[PDB]
Amino acid sequence: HHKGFAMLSIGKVGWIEKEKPAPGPFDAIVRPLAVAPCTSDIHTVFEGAIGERHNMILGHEAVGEVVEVGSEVKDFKPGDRVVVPANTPDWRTSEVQRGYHQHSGGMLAGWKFSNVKDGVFGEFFHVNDADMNLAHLPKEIPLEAAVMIPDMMTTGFHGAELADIELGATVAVLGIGPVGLMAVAGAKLRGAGRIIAVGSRPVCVDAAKYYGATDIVNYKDGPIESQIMNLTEGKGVDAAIIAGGNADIMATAVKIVKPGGTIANVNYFPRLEWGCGMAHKTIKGGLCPGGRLRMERLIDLVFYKRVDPSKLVTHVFRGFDNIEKAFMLMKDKPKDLIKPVVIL
Amino acid sequence: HHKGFAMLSIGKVGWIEKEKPAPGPFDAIVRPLAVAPCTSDIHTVFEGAIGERHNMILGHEAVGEVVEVGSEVKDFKPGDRVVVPANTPDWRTSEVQRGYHQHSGGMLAGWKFSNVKDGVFGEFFHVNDADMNLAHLPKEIPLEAAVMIPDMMTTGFHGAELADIELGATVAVLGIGPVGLMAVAGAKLRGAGRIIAVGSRPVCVDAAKYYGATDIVNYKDGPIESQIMNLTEGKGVDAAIIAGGNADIMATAVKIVKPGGTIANVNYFPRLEWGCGMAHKTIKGGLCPGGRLRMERLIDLVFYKRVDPSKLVTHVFRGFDNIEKAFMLMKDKPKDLIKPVVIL
Amino acid sequence: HHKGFAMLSIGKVGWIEKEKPAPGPFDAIVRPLAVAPCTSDIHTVFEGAIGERHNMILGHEAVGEVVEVGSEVKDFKPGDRVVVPANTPDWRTSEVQRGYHQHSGGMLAGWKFSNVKDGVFGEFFHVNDADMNLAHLPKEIPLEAAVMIPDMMTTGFHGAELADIELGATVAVLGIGPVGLMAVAGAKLRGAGRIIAVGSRPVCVDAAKYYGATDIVNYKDGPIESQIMNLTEGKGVDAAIIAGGNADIMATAVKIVKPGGTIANVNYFPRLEWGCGMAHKTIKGGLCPGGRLRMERLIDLVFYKRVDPSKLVTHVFRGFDNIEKAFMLMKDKPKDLIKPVVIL
Amino acid sequence: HHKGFAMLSIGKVGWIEKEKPAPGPFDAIVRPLAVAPCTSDIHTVFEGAIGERHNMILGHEAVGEVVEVGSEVKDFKPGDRVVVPANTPDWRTSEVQRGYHQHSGGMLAGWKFSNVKDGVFGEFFHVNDADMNLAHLPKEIPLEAAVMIPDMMTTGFHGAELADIELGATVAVLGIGPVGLMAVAGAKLRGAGRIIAVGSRPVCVDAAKYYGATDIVNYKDGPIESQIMNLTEGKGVDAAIIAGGNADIMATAVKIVKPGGTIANVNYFPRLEWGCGMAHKTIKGGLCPGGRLRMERLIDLVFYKRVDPSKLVTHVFRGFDNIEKAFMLMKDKPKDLIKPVVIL
Ligand SMILES: [Mg+2]
Ligand SMILES: [Mg+2]
Ligand SMILES: [Mg+2]
Ligand SMILES: [Mg+2]
Ligand SMILES: [Mg+2]
Ligand SMILES: [Mg+2]
Ligand SMILES: [Mg+2]
Ligand SMILES: [Mg+2]
Ligand SMILES: [Zn+2]
Ligand SMILES: [Zn+2]
Ligand SMILES: [Zn+2]
Ligand SMILES: [Zn+2]
């Protein structure tokens, strides 16, 4: 019996008592050391993104310490400091063998935390297939930087990877939230040249400039498409990454990308003509990549100072009782907030 | 001064007389030996697909004999039997260096015939960059089979190529017109296993069965999506090729393709969720591939009996005066018609 | 306690008694219905390819029926007719997540049969990770055709896949043994145009002509390189697949492939210059692909009549006692032998 | 009639006077503003790398100003400051349509400077297909940095591109010459994690540390293979780039790369086993990339401060007469020399 911050119903949250999870032969029990609320939790609680839930613990971004393992777990033991990916696929299924985007398949059943399984906002949580999902966290990486790996960094970096960025190419990132900031960082990591970031919030604009954006487009000089086309002298961009917005941002991305380019869509929750190139494009989407290898490679990127995700963390809280406060801060989204982190 | 079948205005066609085209240093003049009307010509004439045109010769699918060449033309001489691609890109521009889909770039200005330039339905027509566009036609290939190469075969085969077909994968082809039939043939050429063809016309169904379709889905038996999902026992298809229909066929293709799959759109003229794989897809579109290398490789495929496009030709006409009759047949689309060919 | 045909010390084979294998929670026990000796077994026994072995049952190409399964096996039950791949990777390790060639990784520890584990030439054998390795065999596929799938078909088809074959490209297959014949079939399945097969044995030449080879090069007519260059008028081939021979055939393959082409090496057991394209090549090698998905896709290819591997089977034997006779036939390769099959 | 620094014969070098080149309709005449000798010139002169030459002007790395153009040249006019790529392919032949490595084909005939055509070490030189080869140089890029683009930067960056580097992967660079330093920079630009540089010269080691190398392996501390395997704890590297050395470095690269990895060979001038992964590798080689688009993308990388190639320049000379001194310095290869540059 442990504590957990759970969704009572659509629009209701509170602290409840639940039975302490037990690990199977291939599972592990992890207690969190640092957690971070996400906009997905808010969409679930208040927008009914995944339907109706009752007494479901929220949260899917945690860095924790292993406290219990199954009998068949070999690579991790209690006391090990680990990074828990947000997506934890089932690896004992032939579906994982299918594979796409140069990674493993079956990445639809991996979205378990806070969807069909208790989240990380508790004293303990359950990780399936621990040897296939968990990754060791070196002691030289701070907790606030490490907690950005499980969801934000992996989603943004996969958005950059799917954009088919060539060396020196011009890349546009629509939406400069945390996922968009990580998309800018990933575009820089892919050898992009000019990077155009679309956004208006001063703190997000400063973060985008820090992470490698060379041009900032504000939705006050005029339409986004006109500004971007004027920036590139009518040539457009080689690739665009969609990280936030509404359906109009998809039309804008189609408008601004050159024929043969790629539009990557990682934002969670027309006709072919001879004289118009708007339909001569590739649109790739997916919240695919999770697992131990992905986490290990991101950890290697952080460890060797290729990227510093600490700039995403604008608010730091101490103690278990501040999870609700961080969630509320995520709800009302003040102007100076990018991503809050609770250190346990 | 020569004759040609031209679009008088939106909805008006007739035989007009025009000045004989002259070739530049890198150009060639070709007289046609076999031509084929397309649905694109009908869309331009009667649906205003490309705007208003005046006395513009129609047609973009011809097999012809070189009549005269420019001073800088080296690989072709008058008397050579050649295949003229529908797309003839400008090759003396840096745009062709920015390629995609493992071919050259600049494949938007290549759509010249019957769009911004006189078509092939005349006694002569003009081909730009002859050494980079024309391809030699061996005498062992019949004219009716060869005339299917310039547009239908290349479009269908590129649709199959962009679908990312793996060996033994299940492929669905939506629309079994000539482009869809060539898409079925290309899917077979890419090592597909089960091929599901969606269509109802008996002649097109017979052609699809001939070209490698193992299952036929008729829309007179219920929704396409439900039938296809029943055929695959709820697994869906690995890839889908869109060759005809309306915007609802795009939704059907998105519904039937498994997560991580590819939807290829060669038919000329959702939100990311944890529990729904509809948005976890790749959509590739383009009427890209033209030029001499593409024509030569298709000619090699025909020559070595890898594919026989003669089944597409259901009506054969002799004489220049039958071009109007073939165009009218294309307009009224009778029961037994797939593709008419006029032999000069 | 069951019977098995085993290698005794070296150059010595015989029938021995061994303890009947028992399955783990994720394993299954399979009895064979059809088996096929391989040249790899002969290299192991007589050439010391893998070192010294004692009482090790040989054979790695079997089609069998499930006899019993572990408690955690869900997709297969006793009585099911299955195809057993030659490569059976360990799937409960993070190594398979790495991945290459658009398939799963860790395909080095999968070579277990007759290498570090008892082979299939016994009354029973052990298959690890049954739900991830075994594949259902439909009743409409004959045993002789099905037993070509586990090693020959997968190796040849992966050789064709790694060759980066484009539609209509010219492909050369060096060595027309069973793996080379399957490479010819795979090249045809990938949309190749001209296919040049290099070999001299009349039965293998006939099989190569059946599987899609358009040109046959005999080494009794001069050097292979000179003949191939004469066939292509000095242009060379777009890709080459090496299926048999020594380092000299690798040198020939480097010589005959055009700059930028790919040489695929699936045969088990230069300096960069401005004016010479010999080193401007890509050489891909690997006995990679194994597992349930690979077997299922190959089974789909056979089921839908995309390929008929029955032409490989030249000798058919009945009864358990004929395994030694088939192995001896494999040893002293006669004129009319391609692949012997023993039906149980 | 102009002066030029030419190779008199094998081992003989001096200043000669030659007729001033004249441009064709698609050509341009360029006078150099900064030039850099290369090891390729020394191999040509003192080692007979390309055979015997008589009065052939050397040099293939220049940044210059357009002096005059042909009648068909449109994108460049006299007075324009341009970057001249070392490889200048013929763009009016169908061969460029073939294409590989996601760029254009026909790149073997692009190696013209100081091979089959007068080099850049003269008062003027000839550039074929100016609109397809030349690239505008912004005034904000210094000459010393810009002159590293034509050969060193493009070769190293293509070596990094062909290595198939994934985010966070470990990359080894064998050879820490200027091409190897640019390979380290390109590996960093591709999102590599740990980068291991193999070299011993202190100036080259310092440059490698500057460009992103995290580990340095000195051959005075034991075998390279053993040191690298100890660094990675026996796992090896995900990819290796060969930029200098002898045939033993290829064996070392094969030994250190993990199965399924890629070895890229850009340094100008095993059998498949079940238990050994040495042959389960991909070897890619080529001095491929040249042309206007490549130069423009590299210029964009330099302009937006993604890479600073000024660290390569250790010796700067002023005046035309110092070309011989720079060439001699390249011959003697002193301790503190990486790349000399002559500013005109
Ligand atoms: Mg993905
Ligand atoms: Mg992973
Ligand atoms: Mg295309
Ligand atoms: Mg072409
Ligand atoms: Mg493989
Ligand atoms: Mg598999
Ligand atoms: Mg290349
Ligand atoms: Mg270029
Ligand atoms: Zn999240
Ligand atoms: Zn058409
Ligand atoms: Zn075998
Ligand atoms: Zn050089």
Numbering used by the authors:
A (entry chain D), B (entry chain C), C (entry chain B), D (entry chain A): 0 to 268, 277 to 351
Pull text from the paper.
The obtained experimental data revealed that triazoles induced the aggregation of Thermoanaerobacter brockii alcohol dehydrogenase (TbSADH) to form a gel complex; however, its stability was very low. Intermolecular interactions in this gel were strengthened by the synergistic chelation of metal ions. The active center catalyzing the asymmetric reduction of aryl prochiral ketones is mainly composed of Zn2+ ions and three amino acid residues (H59, C37, and D150). The activity of TbSADH is associated with the rate of hydride transfer from NADPH to the substrate.
Using cryogenic electron microscopy (Cryo-EM), a structure–property relationship of the enzyme after gelation was analyzed for the improved catalytic performance, and a near-atomic-level enzyme structure with an ultra-high resolution of 2.1 Å was obtained. In this model, the tetrameric enzyme has a symmetrical tetrahedral structure with one Zn2+ active center in each subunit, and no Hmtz was found in the structure, suggesting that Hmtz may bind to the enzyme by a non-specific manner. According to the structure of the active center, Zn2+ was not bound by triazole, indicating that the triazoles acted on the enzyme surface without entering the active center to scavenge Zn2+. Moreover, the cryo-EM structure of EAG enzyme provides a structural perspective for its activity enhancement. The large motion of the loop consisting of residues L107 to H100 with a 4.1 Å shift at residue L107 and 10.5 Å shift at residue H100 leads to a major structural rearrangement of the mutant. The loop motion further induced the side chain flipping of residue W110 with a torsion angle of 94.5°, thereby expanding the substrate-binding pocket of the enzyme. The larger binding pocket may promote the conformational sampling of the substrate and increase the frequency of productive binding modes, thereby increasing the catalytic efficiency of the enzyme. This is consistent with the increased kcat value obtained using a kinetic analysis. Meanwhile, the coordination effect of Mg2+ ions improved the enzyme robustness, which resulted in higher stability than that of the free enzyme against various unfavorable environmental factors. Note that in the presence of trypsin (3 mg mL−1 for 3 h at 25 °C), EAG retained 74.6% of its original activity compared to the value of 15.3% determined for the free enzyme. In addition, the melting temperature (Tm) of EAG (10 mM Mg2+) measured using differential scanning calorimetry (DSC) was 133.8 °C, which was 35.2 °C higher than that of the free enzyme (see below), indicating that the robustness of EAG was significantly improved with respect to that of the free enzyme.
